[PDB]
Amino acid sequence: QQPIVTGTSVISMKYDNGVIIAADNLGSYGSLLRFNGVERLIPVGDNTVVGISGDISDMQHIERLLKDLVTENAYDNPLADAEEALEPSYIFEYLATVMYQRRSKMNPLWNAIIVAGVQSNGDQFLRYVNLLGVTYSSPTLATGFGAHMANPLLRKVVDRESDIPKTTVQVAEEAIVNAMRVLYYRDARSSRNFSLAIIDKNTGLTFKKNLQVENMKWDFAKDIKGYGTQKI
Amino acid sequence: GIQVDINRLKKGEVSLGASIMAVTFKDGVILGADSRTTTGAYIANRVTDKLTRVHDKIWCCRSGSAADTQAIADIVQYHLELYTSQYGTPSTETAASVFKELCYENKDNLTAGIIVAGYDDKNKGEVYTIPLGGSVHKLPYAIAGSGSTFIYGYCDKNFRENMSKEETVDFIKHSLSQAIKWDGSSGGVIRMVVLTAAGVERLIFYPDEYEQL
Amino acid sequence: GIQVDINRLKKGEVSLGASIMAVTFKDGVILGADSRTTTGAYIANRVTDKLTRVHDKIWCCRSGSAADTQAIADIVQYHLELYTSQYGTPSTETAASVFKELCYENKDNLTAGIIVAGYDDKNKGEVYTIPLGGSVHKLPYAIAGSGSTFIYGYCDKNFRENMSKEETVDFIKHSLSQAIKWDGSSGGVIRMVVLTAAGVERLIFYPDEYEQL
Amino acid sequence: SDPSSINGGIVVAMTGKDCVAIACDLRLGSQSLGVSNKFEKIFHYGHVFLGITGLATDVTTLNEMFRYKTNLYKLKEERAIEPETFTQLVSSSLYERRFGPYFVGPVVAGINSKSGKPFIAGFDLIGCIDEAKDFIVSGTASDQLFGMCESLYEPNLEPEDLFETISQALLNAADRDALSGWGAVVYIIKKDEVVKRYLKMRQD
Amino acid sequence: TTTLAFRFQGGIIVAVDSRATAGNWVASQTVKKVIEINPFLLGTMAGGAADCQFWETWLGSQCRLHELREKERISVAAASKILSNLVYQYKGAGLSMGTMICGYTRKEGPTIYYVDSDGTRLKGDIFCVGSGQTFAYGVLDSNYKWDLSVEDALYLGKRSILAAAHRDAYSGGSVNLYHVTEDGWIYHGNHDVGELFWKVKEEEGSFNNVIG
Amino acid sequence: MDIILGIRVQDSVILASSKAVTRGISVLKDSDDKTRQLSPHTLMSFAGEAGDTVQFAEYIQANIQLYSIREDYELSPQAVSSFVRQELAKSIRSRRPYQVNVLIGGYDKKKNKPELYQIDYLGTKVELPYGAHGYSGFYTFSLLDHHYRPDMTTEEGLDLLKLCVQELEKRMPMDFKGVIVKIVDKDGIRQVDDF
Amino acid sequence: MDIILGIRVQDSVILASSKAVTRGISVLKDSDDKTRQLSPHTLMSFAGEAGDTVQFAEYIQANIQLYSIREDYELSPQAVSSFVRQELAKSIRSRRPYQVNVLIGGYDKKKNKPELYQIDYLGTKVELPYGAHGYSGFYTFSLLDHHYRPDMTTEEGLDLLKLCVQELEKRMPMDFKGVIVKIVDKDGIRQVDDF
Amino acid sequence: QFNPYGDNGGTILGIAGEDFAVLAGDTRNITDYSINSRYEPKVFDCGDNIVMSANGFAADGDALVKRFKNSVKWYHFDHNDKKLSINSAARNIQHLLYGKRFFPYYVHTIIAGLDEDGKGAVYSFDPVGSYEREQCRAGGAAASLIMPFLDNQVNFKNQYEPGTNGKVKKPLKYLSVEEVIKLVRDSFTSATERHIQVGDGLEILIVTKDGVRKEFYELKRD
Amino acid sequence: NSHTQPKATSTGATIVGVKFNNGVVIAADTRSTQGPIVADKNCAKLHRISPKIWCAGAGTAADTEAVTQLIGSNIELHSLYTSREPRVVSALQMLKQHLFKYQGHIGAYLIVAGVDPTGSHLFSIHAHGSTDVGYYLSLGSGSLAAMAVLESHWKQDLTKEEAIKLASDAIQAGIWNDLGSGSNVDVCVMEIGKDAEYLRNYLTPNVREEKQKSYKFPRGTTAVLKESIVNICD
Ligand SMILES: *[C@@](C)(CO)[C@](*)(O)[C@H](CC(C)C)NC(=O)[C@H](Cc1ccccc1)NC(=O)[C@H](CC(C)C)NC(=O)[C@H](CCc1ccccc1)NC(=O)CN1CCOCC1
Ligand SMILES: [Cl-]
Ligand SMILES: [Cl-]
Ligand SMILES: [Mg+2]
Ligand SMILES: [Mg+2]
């Protein structure tokens, strides 16, 4: 078993009133950049966003499970849109259970997943889970290349817990958008087009589609000639 | 199916996977290339120069292994400099022959897909392509690199002989634009080198321009 | 490369390496395909029909394993016939879902790259592509098969939405012509199937015509 | 069939106030079988000391080789080789066999006779120099030695106190390694006197 | 590991080391390798630690159920066969166990059964099991007589483990002694090799290979 | 699987070596002498890969005999052992190494002391009071740890050796057809015919 | 490996079986009886994979004893051998086959004739005047081709057997610690204590 | 081909006193050469004055702890709210681990608490269930660095009484909670210096008859 | 040729190079690893090829030190032969041709930087013999963490002080986020018309805190069997 059509990095971070999460709109087929209209951020209710990387067929399977979870929660539940609504912590633990069960049957869902959201009591939720069933939480979280390149940049803003209240939504979103640009420079299986989602405890869920990487530095390339000695 | 070319590369070495092409036209010949260099899925260099000078008006496009193509191009440049000191300016055919000799005789230890392009006054613009095997093929235009697969259809339909400079630049720009769009191993800026009687001209084109073609 | 698509096949099985595509247009949708079937480098069948009916106005293009795609298409046709007996005419989306379910749940044992295309009266022409992984992708047009690699550049540059019937037929003909020219696994005649409100029309085009385009 | 862990053994070196210490175990085995409990791994050429862990045949071969090279050095230079110079000689000699290396983990220790500065250094099998103020470790219980040294070590220890620290580091590391132990030797090296002590340790 | 047990005039001597390894890493020096099944039955452990520990405590449960059902203490033969039939069901699955079931009953007398994970079950007077079994055999065989005293037999068992503890890299820690009579098993203490080696070297005058 | 033992006592060195030569499922010979005299007071026993053992032993023997003629002088056991070790140390990094393990028992006439050296095919030399190669050591070392004393006589050493052979005959899987015993002392080398 | 032999003579069947049980480089036991009595006039010797041998032998023994009680009648050696063969023939195509080879020596009371059957782990049965499993056959078969006669007595058969054991002790690589000999005849099964 | 195991690094440490017991563990979580989290706790209060940590492959570690916590819950339901003794918990964990003998939990487990005489207890487990009570145990990535230090400082190994000719050993005695925490903090700072997978933060859980207390300390973040 | 040694030291690292107004600056961390163990907590990864050409090295530690010294030796002889100050392209050419000849078996990954009569230069060399030119470059296990910072903050026309800040910030990103890198930050500045200044331990943000206890043993704690004076003199 292996992933065929794949999605690359998913990045995310916490800020004073909520969480931000982002992911590009590419479905790679090996080295071929085959599909360009792939949404890899999937909202669940008006308080959670699940970002998924890895195998896209397995992503679409998870989509259907989450869709079905909202339906099932509504059954015989008069408080489905109030006290007994789906929380980010519920949605995550469900997925984490599935991922670990599948790895334990030697038949894993190939993915790396980040569940971002805001709880009912206003607390920020951000936690990671992957094909192995491994889970962890941190002020910043990222998958694939994001882990190597985005996290370093995002940790300069929020290095520890105490930096979260000091970080505004403007500063946080700027860091995310910057990180997406760096990934476009340096990740061979990434695209310019991406989606971004903000879940705030006050202003709620804001889903931004069709964003582009901009303000790129390419001008210095013209001065670079040859690979050593060549002058022309 | 061309994963096999990448398969030939030594473990962990830098890969040139590329979108390179050379096109003859009325006034001479134009070489074109992307600027991406990869180590797996990490882009080691996003502003590479794959168009390299082996003589005043004989250049080449490099693809395959970065190390192998550089080592070869350096040796060829040495041979042609020594040729010039004894026998005067070498023909583009002569340059392609020296490339072939190195690529063919070391075909097992090398991964180098090279396009040779030059301008004589007698022979005008000429293009020779040298694939992995070490064979030589003289053509009106040539395409190569991992990204070239995606533009065989486009280039065959759109290429005409005796094009103008502006038409040839548009042909190369549109072609490499598509190759870059579809090939993950290709990207960055589009470098070009114009070879005519007038001299040598370097051109560059940035993403903001060519992406929205 | 294309190898790991063909590296999937079981030893000795018939290969459906292909040049298949489906294109939506003003009046509906058109499916297109070559007619070549190979066992290694031997052409087992030069007049194959890769465009197959799963319902009156829901057809599919097959690529990958001949056996696997046939077995799948037969099961889908059975499901949609049983669907029609109980719930009436199924949507093109419904057909694509049944294809996905079979391809995804049996992704390890199967090699089937299927394009689903159909005509509703409400939804007009629709195209869904289902690659090896078993994922579904709804698109304005789709290309697939070993020969599709060579026409990504051409098709992206030349495709427009809301084309006429004659324009779409020319678009498919020129595209598959190039795919056939460059891909050894593709060849023979170019079959097409037109899906509109008028009905179902079969078209064929022979080498003597399309080769010299 | 891993050359570095057939025979087993350990070496450790430390610095102190105007002194250095170098210590080693005495075991030589053939995998599980203990064969000799008298196999010393520390040698000296003039005032420069060299400890060597790893494949025993190479330990012996390198000792004979550096005895050879330091003797010719002395005849031509008309002086004893210094630790800094000897360290470079070991590095050169190991890298000369880059693609057919001696399977060893050598450790240099000594005091420079001119400047009086305490000096220690370690190498990998192909001659990569590892210089350190505090301590150097080598052998099949290197992980254990790293742990003991990092916690027990403090700078500017007197020779008598330094002896206790290095001895406790070696003993407790050796007892957590199956292929190391069976006795131990500790060298305490001052500017112009050198004391050699054999430690009592558990013989299993 | 190194474990042994031998039969003699005055019953059965059982002796084991206490080391546990994970490759060349010495993980523990204080492992109990003798399991006390009941006042008349002992079991030794060698091989996979978990396998031995788990299945021999399980064996003790099966022996208890026997005496509840049959109103009589289980025989050594029957107890050993429960274990040998169990591991035989897991043959090929990768269990690693080298055990000895030692005990006394009226009908059998003092009896020792070797039982290993590839299904072998053997009755016998002398057995040494483990990575250092050969080292123990060398000392034990060359000094063994049926007419040994309880004092001499206890010492020979202790000395045979010590010999193996010394030479075998994967044996050591401390020696646990047991003596089995008609009245049941009797524990004869934990003996650390740290002190025991030097005590034995001085008093016995042996171990001349070592720097005294 | 080939048994070679060595015991150094007060005034002599005793080497015991198995007589069996086995190929496949057949014992081709049961009276083989796995040793060569290097010099009047130096004896080397050997065991390992077929062919290599005798080829190596005789090659060393020739070199030591050449030295004796040239200098009209016998090399010390320490000197011979160092020469042998270096040859094996060269060998291990050759195209095809000698897969031979040896024991060198000698009497140094200048020191008036017996000496026993154990060298493996890698070139790993150790001086020992008692030594063994192959699987024999797994039994004999622990046995000798117990029974050996440094001040023993040659007769006490032979009884100590009998104790080893008995144990090996009891617990070894293969029939090695007994041993040939030889004693090295101040009066040279001699063979014990009845063992 | 393990040695199991069988010789059918005029009025009896003689089975010889090695006493050694070896694991690794240690002979764990030198008095092992590699046989089980299936019925008063039927004896089965066995050799092969550790554990499997005794587990198989006892399983057969139980089944034959169950038959004897049920029918109050002893099964003929031919009938027992056929039952054993079928069990091995089933076994070889199982998930984990019994890797056991056996010799079945019996005295048929109805025919008043001794019978010897050789069955391998595949379920390959043959009735023979003399038989052997493992590497033993490579020596004993040719020896018995020469010395065996069909009309021999039990005493002549034991001398013929001694000749086999001597040859094996001379030319076999492994020490198999002698053999336990048992005789099957009209008066049942008995063991020769001094061999 | 799919590999179901992974290494999440980290290291843990248990020490037992006279009337108390500590179970410490760093808060860093890693994969390969990347840091996943600087604060991800892996030492858990499981109720009945039992603290537990299962270091190694975090997914298996979490699954095990989760299952033991649940085992404690069902022990109360089935046996009239009886307190689960540390020795009983240890045996129960053995069966959890050995239950997956042929597809193991890749973890080194340590539990700590008080025995039924009120005295400090530490139990340690291998991946397949073999267990042993000890005064002292380090587990995880830096176990080989810390463990010999503990042999020397807790159990006074290789230390003799000065002037007694190496004849009289240093006498064993229980350590105070203050002295034990000193050894823990020094063990982890040393392990942080020399092991790349160890750092960020240290979380100690102390268990006395009064309950379970926590203490946190910063560690180097490189 | 031997296909790798696992025992051979191969340190994790973060080395970078940044070009500025009147020259070039390189920097590095100071951790040397053995597997997961930190062997040296303050090694020097910045090497001198010539007075004004310096070389940062990652990969197989023995190969980077050995190859930098060999080329440095030949560069010195070349400088004396030609009566000229050595050029960076000469070191570049000699390094790549050596590394290429061994087909990657010499695992040296280098950032070369310096000044010479031609101007200021910055190159990178990979083990297989390929070379790259750039204004900003990063190698080592923490190259991605460093390059993320370089891509975020680098601009054209950097000053000396800005380049040192950018370089050390890139190394810090490796120190904190990459497990292979750590400890201190070394820097070397090479400006045109001036001597190159080597700033050993330019930053030390990872100082070991005071230990809770002293582990100085009472004298006599260790049991001893034999004492003897060793003769070092003739
Ligand atoms: C002598 C000492 C050696 O043979 C004895 O035989 C003892 C027997 C006593 C303990 C009963 N044997 C061992 O000590 C035994 C050796 C061994 C190891 C593995 C398989 C067979 C035999 N040691 C163990 O079993 C250790 C005991 C631990 C240290 C308490 N356990 C392990 O090595 C475990 C589990 C092994 C295992 C077996 C089957 C399936 C899965 C796992 N492995 C680890 O702990 C892995 N790892 C090693 C490095 O440290 C981190 C954990
Ligand atoms: Cl390049
Ligand atoms: Cl078909
Ligand atoms: Mg064709
Ligand atoms: Mg030992």
Tab-separated table of N, CA and C in Angstrom, chain A residues 1-2 93 97 100 103-104 106-108 110 127 131-138 140-141 147-148 151 155 159-160, chain H residues 1-6 8 29 34-40 57-60 62-63 66 100 103-105 218 221:
chain	number	residue	atom	x	y	z
A	1	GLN	N	0.829	-1.250	0.000
A	1	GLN	CA	0.000	0.000	0.000
A	1	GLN	C	0.843	1.269	0.000
A	2	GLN	N	0.446	2.239	-0.825
A	2	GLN	CA	1.129	3.533	-0.916
A	2	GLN	C	0.160	4.629	-1.377
A	93	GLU	N	-10.708	13.325	18.674
A	93	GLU	CA	-10.573	12.035	19.345
A	93	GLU	C	-11.167	10.904	18.509
A	97	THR	N	-8.931	7.916	17.066
A	97	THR	CA	-9.337	6.531	17.308
A	97	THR	C	-9.299	5.718	16.013
A	100	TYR	N	-5.572	5.120	14.639
A	100	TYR	CA	-4.835	4.108	15.399
A	100	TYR	C	-5.395	2.699	15.192
A	103	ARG	N	-4.115	1.554	11.674
A	103	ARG	CA	-2.691	1.186	11.712
A	103	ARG	C	-2.506	-0.157	12.419
A	104	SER	N	-3.382	-0.438	13.383
A	104	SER	CA	-3.330	-1.678	14.158
A	104	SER	C	-3.841	-2.882	13.365
A	106	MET	N	-2.934	-3.021	10.174
A	106	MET	CA	-1.970	-2.942	9.065
A	106	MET	C	-2.610	-2.450	7.765
A	107	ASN	N	-3.541	-1.509	7.902
A	107	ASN	CA	-4.313	-0.986	6.781
A	107	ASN	C	-4.610	0.498	7.020
A	108	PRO	N	-3.549	1.320	7.102
A	108	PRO	CA	-3.664	2.696	7.589
A	108	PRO	C	-4.317	3.663	6.612
A	110	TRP	N	-3.385	6.866	5.419
A	110	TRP	CA	-2.199	7.598	5.028
A	110	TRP	C	-2.343	9.093	5.150
A	127	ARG	N	-4.503	20.265	17.549
A	127	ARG	CA	-3.855	18.978	17.792
A	127	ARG	C	-3.637	18.192	16.496
A	131	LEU	N	-1.079	8.799	10.225
A	131	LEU	CA	-1.309	7.392	9.872
A	131	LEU	C	-0.961	6.386	10.974
A	132	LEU	N	0.072	6.679	11.762
A	132	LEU	CA	0.506	5.788	12.844
A	132	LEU	C	-0.365	5.885	14.099
A	133	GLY	N	-1.241	6.884	14.150
A	133	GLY	CA	-2.063	7.137	15.334
A	133	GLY	C	-1.370	8.025	16.355
A	134	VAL	N	-0.192	8.537	15.996
A	134	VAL	CA	0.589	9.404	16.875
A	134	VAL	C	-0.104	10.749	17.001
A	135	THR	N	-0.248	11.229	18.233
A	135	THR	CA	-0.880	12.523	18.489
A	135	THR	C	0.010	13.434	19.323
A	136	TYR	N	-0.031	14.725	19.009
A	136	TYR	CA	0.601	15.743	19.840
A	136	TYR	C	-0.023	17.110	19.600
A	137	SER	N	0.157	17.993	20.577
A	137	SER	CA	-0.351	19.356	20.521
A	137	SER	C	0.790	20.337	20.792
A	138	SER	N	0.669	21.536	20.230
A	138	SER	CA	1.695	22.574	20.345
A	138	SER	C	1.108	23.903	19.866
A	140	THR	N	2.211	25.891	17.676
A	140	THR	CA	2.268	25.797	16.213
A	140	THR	C	2.344	24.333	15.807
A	141	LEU	N	1.672	23.987	14.712
A	141	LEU	CA	1.707	22.626	14.174
A	141	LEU	C	1.731	22.641	12.655
A	147	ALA	N	6.537	21.132	8.599
A	147	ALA	CA	7.219	20.822	9.856
A	147	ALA	C	8.673	21.303	9.860
A	148	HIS	N	9.338	21.203	8.710
A	148	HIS	CA	10.747	21.583	8.589
A	148	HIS	C	10.976	23.077	8.348
A	151	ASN	N	7.237	25.683	10.787
A	151	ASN	CA	7.352	25.700	12.253
A	151	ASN	C	8.446	26.635	12.794
A	155	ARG	N	7.290	29.674	15.127
A	155	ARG	CA	7.771	29.643	16.511
A	155	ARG	C	8.515	30.923	16.915
A	159	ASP	N	6.651	31.229	20.607
A	159	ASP	CA	7.676	30.262	21.000
A	159	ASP	C	7.202	29.368	22.149
A	160	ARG	N	6.391	29.921	23.049
A	160	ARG	CA	5.810	29.147	24.151
A	160	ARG	C	4.366	29.574	24.455
H	1	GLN	N	7.034	-0.472	1.833
H	1	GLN	CA	6.112	-1.296	2.678
H	1	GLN	C	5.831	-0.585	4.008
H	2	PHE	N	4.581	-0.650	4.465
H	2	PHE	CA	4.137	0.086	5.659
H	2	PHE	C	4.770	-0.400	6.970
H	3	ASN	N	5.362	0.541	7.706
H	3	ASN	CA	5.972	0.276	9.011
H	3	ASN	C	5.113	0.873	10.129
H	4	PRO	N	4.501	0.013	10.969
H	4	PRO	CA	3.520	0.477	11.953
H	4	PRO	C	4.108	1.109	13.213
H	5	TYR	N	5.429	1.065	13.372
H	5	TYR	CA	6.073	1.646	14.547
H	5	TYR	C	6.806	2.939	14.211
H	6	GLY	N	7.007	3.760	15.236
H	6	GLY	CA	7.777	4.995	15.129
H	6	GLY	C	8.451	5.283	16.457
H	8	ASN	N	9.218	8.210	19.097
H	8	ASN	CA	8.891	9.566	19.544
H	8	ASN	C	9.851	10.103	20.603
H	29	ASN	N	8.595	15.958	22.573
H	29	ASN	CA	8.138	14.911	21.651
H	29	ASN	C	8.756	15.146	20.272
H	34	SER	N	13.209	16.372	13.927
H	34	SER	CA	12.271	17.475	14.138
H	34	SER	C	11.646	17.407	15.521
H	35	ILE	N	11.271	18.571	16.044
H	35	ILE	CA	10.532	18.667	17.301
H	35	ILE	C	9.045	18.795	16.983
H	36	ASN	N	8.242	17.913	17.567
H	36	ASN	CA	6.794	17.949	17.390
H	36	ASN	C	6.148	18.878	18.408
H	37	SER	N	6.541	18.717	19.668
H	37	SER	CA	6.029	19.543	20.752
H	37	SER	C	7.096	19.727	21.827
H	38	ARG	N	7.146	20.927	22.403
H	38	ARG	CA	8.059	21.225	23.505
H	38	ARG	C	7.418	20.892	24.849
H	39	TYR	N	6.087	20.855	24.886
H	39	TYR	CA	5.362	20.420	26.080
H	39	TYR	C	4.230	19.456	25.729
H	40	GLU	N	4.542	18.164	25.781
H	40	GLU	CA	3.560	17.098	25.604
H	40	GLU	C	3.765	16.095	26.742
H	57	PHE	N	7.198	4.588	21.526
H	57	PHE	CA	6.271	4.927	20.453
H	57	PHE	C	4.995	5.496	21.080
H	58	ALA	N	4.798	6.804	20.934
H	58	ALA	CA	3.760	7.540	21.677
H	58	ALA	C	2.340	7.007	21.473
H	59	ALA	N	2.027	6.577	20.255
H	59	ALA	CA	0.699	6.041	19.951
H	59	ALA	C	0.397	4.807	20.800
H	60	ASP	N	1.367	3.894	20.879
H	60	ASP	CA	1.248	2.697	21.720
H	60	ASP	C	1.270	3.060	23.198
H	62	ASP	N	0.180	5.950	24.559
H	62	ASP	CA	-1.128	6.530	24.875
H	62	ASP	C	-2.200	5.446	24.964
H	63	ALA	N	-2.187	4.518	24.012
H	63	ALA	CA	-3.141	3.411	23.997
H	63	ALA	C	-3.069	2.573	25.275
H	66	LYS	N	-4.219	4.677	28.418
H	66	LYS	CA	-5.669	4.760	28.248
H	66	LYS	C	-6.356	3.463	28.697
H	100	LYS	N	-0.624	-8.552	23.660
H	100	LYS	CA	-0.140	-8.234	22.318
H	100	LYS	C	1.297	-8.737	22.098
H	103	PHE	N	2.267	-8.732	18.464
H	103	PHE	CA	2.241	-7.428	17.793
H	103	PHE	C	2.383	-6.345	18.874
H	104	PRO	N	3.574	-6.263	19.495
H	104	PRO	CA	3.779	-5.584	20.786
H	104	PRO	C	3.571	-4.073	20.830
H	105	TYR	N	3.306	-3.569	22.033
H	105	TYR	CA	3.398	-2.142	22.321
H	105	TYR	C	4.884	-1.793	22.439
H	218	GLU	N	12.271	24.020	33.712
H	218	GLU	CA	12.731	24.289	32.354
H	218	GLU	C	13.969	23.460	32.038
H	221	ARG	N	16.589	24.129	25.270
H	221	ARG	CA	15.671	23.963	24.142
H	221	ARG	C	16.370	23.754	22.794
